């Protein structure tokens, strides 16, 4: 339900929204139309949710990579820039917002990641990734670090993953082949192994996010970060003596950042489509409009020729375009959401040890491909995909279903597939459908095995083997007991991901010892799981997900 006679605009919280609001004030002064600029969290996921019911903003700003998905879902208005207006913007910026031959958004500015370095801490930047460990050892002796950047968004790690041969989709002869994906190849593995090694060697921390890296760089604690033009405003405020420069090489090859074009789409459901056109063409995409936004947070290399020429001599913009030239323009195709979720999952899981680099990238490509081809659309279809993949591995090895050495990798991959898709569809793991699938493999594949414990006649790693062995024991016995094991109202037995819980009486704070899975777990400390007065397991209030309390294990 979008209000006629005004404009609501969504733009990301790292962009110049105060400068965009100034453009909105000038619009209001000439037209009497109020412009509201908002920067909701997760706006790239929020926009398709709310727009799918005819709700949301009149105008949505994001890099062009998300817009094909929006277009395919019918969420975008057709845009109708005449030829004189198109001539005012660079052809390659229009190309970024052309999907199936149609312009689907207005391009605003070209963004690429650069290496940003503290010239006082580090007089010359490193030419290579390989030299960063030695540089960190020197800086650690002085209470500093070499490098901090966002490890939660795969955008920031992609330049290193792509350097030696990682790619999204094969683009040739003007078309993308979504059956030719470059996430699970020797180049992607080399890059992500280098990143995981930086973490294992304590040069970087898997938990570092955008805000932690920005604060550390802007306080002078770290010599280097990786960021885009929008970040320069807060560094200027900090008074750090900074350089913006070419990203370091990996295995002698350039880092290859995915190049974004900040773009503006008009909501299909907007009753304000002509107002939106007027605002974007005659107010924003002018020298005066882009200056107001750029003065708030730098845009990078703007799509408007006349203002790009004016800013072109900024060495920070020169370094931006040098990094852009070495990278690739992101595809705008509908498959980009599934692509980024899969690479997000691979980087987070590999950085935190939840998967090896090979498992992480192999699973990311397999599971993304399940979405790319339209099979998986929701958790029910995801679970059928995970089950079918698992059955295909299990059917040829039937004589060995009671051999842990033969079934432990398939069994582990089934759990990883169920967890990948649970998070993809904003479910907890475990969840009722996932529990039912794991119960089914115990009924179909393991029912004739003589033991509760796995028996045996590149195995899983030490920690993953302990976790999966424990899971297998849980489903062999506690999960299969035919009758209720706690009198009266009770919370149902569950495998929580790390530990097995039996049926527990309503109104009990159940306790077990911390598992021996991690070197930082104290095996004499306690895990708690609360069963409420209605026989429902406790849900953490921040998440509303069913939640076991492991917080005492690593204090």
């Amino acid at each position: 339900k979008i209000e006629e006679g005004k404009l609501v605009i969504w733009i990301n919280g790292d962009k110049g929204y105060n400068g965009l609001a100034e453009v909105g004030k000038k619009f209001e002064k000439d037209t009497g139309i109020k412009v509201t600029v908002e920067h909701p969290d997760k706006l790239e996921e929020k926009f398709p949710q709310v727009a799918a019911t005819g709700d949301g903003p009149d105008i949505i700003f994001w890099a062009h990579d998300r817009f094909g998905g929006y277009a395919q879902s019918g969420l975008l208005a057709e845009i109708t820039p005449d030829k004189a207006f198109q001539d005012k913007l660079y052809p390659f910026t229009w190309d970024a917002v052309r999907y199936n031959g149609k312009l689907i958004a207005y391009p605003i500015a070209v963004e690429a990641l650069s290496l940003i370095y503290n010239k006082d801490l580090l007089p010359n930047p490193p030419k290579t990734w390989e030299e960063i460990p030695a540089l960190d050892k020197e800086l650690k002796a002085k209470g500093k670090s070499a490098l901090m950047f966002n490890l939660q968004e795969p955008y920031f790690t992609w330049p290193l993953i792509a350097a030696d041969g990682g790619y999204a989709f094969k683009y040739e002869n003007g078309k993308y082949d979504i059956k030719d994906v470059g996430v699970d190849n020797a180049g992607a593995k080399a890059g992500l192994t280098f990143l995981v090694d930086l973490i294992k060697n304590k040069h970087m921390n898997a938990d570092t996010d955008y805000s932690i890296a920005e604060a550390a760089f802007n306080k002078g604690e770290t010599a280097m970060t990786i960021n885009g033009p929008w970040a320069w405003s807060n560094i200027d405020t900090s008074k750090v003596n900074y350089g913006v420069t070419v990203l370091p090489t990996f295995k002698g090859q350039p880092s290859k950042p995915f190049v974004g074009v900040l773009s503006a789409g008009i909501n299909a459901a907007s009753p304000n489509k002509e107002l939106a056109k007027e605002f974007l063409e005659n107010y924003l995409l002018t020298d005066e409009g882009l200056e107001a936004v750029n003065k708030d947070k730098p845009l990078g290399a703007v799509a408007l020729k006349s203002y790009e020429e004016e800013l072109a001599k900024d060495p920070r913009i020169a370094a931006t375009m040098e990094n852009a030239q070495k990278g690739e323009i992101m595809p705008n195709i509908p498959q980009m959401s599934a692509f980024w979720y899969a690479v997000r999952t691979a980087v987070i899981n590999a950085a935190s040890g939840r998967q090896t680099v090979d498992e992480a990238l192999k699973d990311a490509q397999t599971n993304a491909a399940a979405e790319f081809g339209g099979t998986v659309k929701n958790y029910e279809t995801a679970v059928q995909f995970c089950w079918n993949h698992y059955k295909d591995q299990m059917d040829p090895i039937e004589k060995d279903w009671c051999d842990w050495a033969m079934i432990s990798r398939p069994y582990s991959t089934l759990r990883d597939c169920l967890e990948h898709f649970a998070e993809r569809f904003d479910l907890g793991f475990p969840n009722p459908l996932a529990e039912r699938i794991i119960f089914e493999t115990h009924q179909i594949h393991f029912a004739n095995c003589s033991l509760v414990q796995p028996t045996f006649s590149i195995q899983l790693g030490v920690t993953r083997n302990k976790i999966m062995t424990a899971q297998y024991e849980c489903y062999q016995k506690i999960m299969q007991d035919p009758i209720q094991q706690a009198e009266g109202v009770y919370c149902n037995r569950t495998w929580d991901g790390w530990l097995c819980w039996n049926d527990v009486a309503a109104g009990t704070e159940s306790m077990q010892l911390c598992p021996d899975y991690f070197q930082d777990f104290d095996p004499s400390e306690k895990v708690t799981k609360i069963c409420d007065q209605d026989g429902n397991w406790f849900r953490h209030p921040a998440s509303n997900r069913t939640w076991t309390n492991y917080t005492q294990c690593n204090v």
Binding site: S352, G353, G497, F518, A542, R545, Y550, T551
Partner: peptide
């Protein structure tokens, strides 16, 4: 060897 560090995401409210 055994993993050095329990994943913080899995201890937090969106984890196990």
């Amino acid at each position: 060897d055994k993993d050095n560090v329990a994943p913080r995401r899995l201890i937090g409210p969106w984890g196990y």
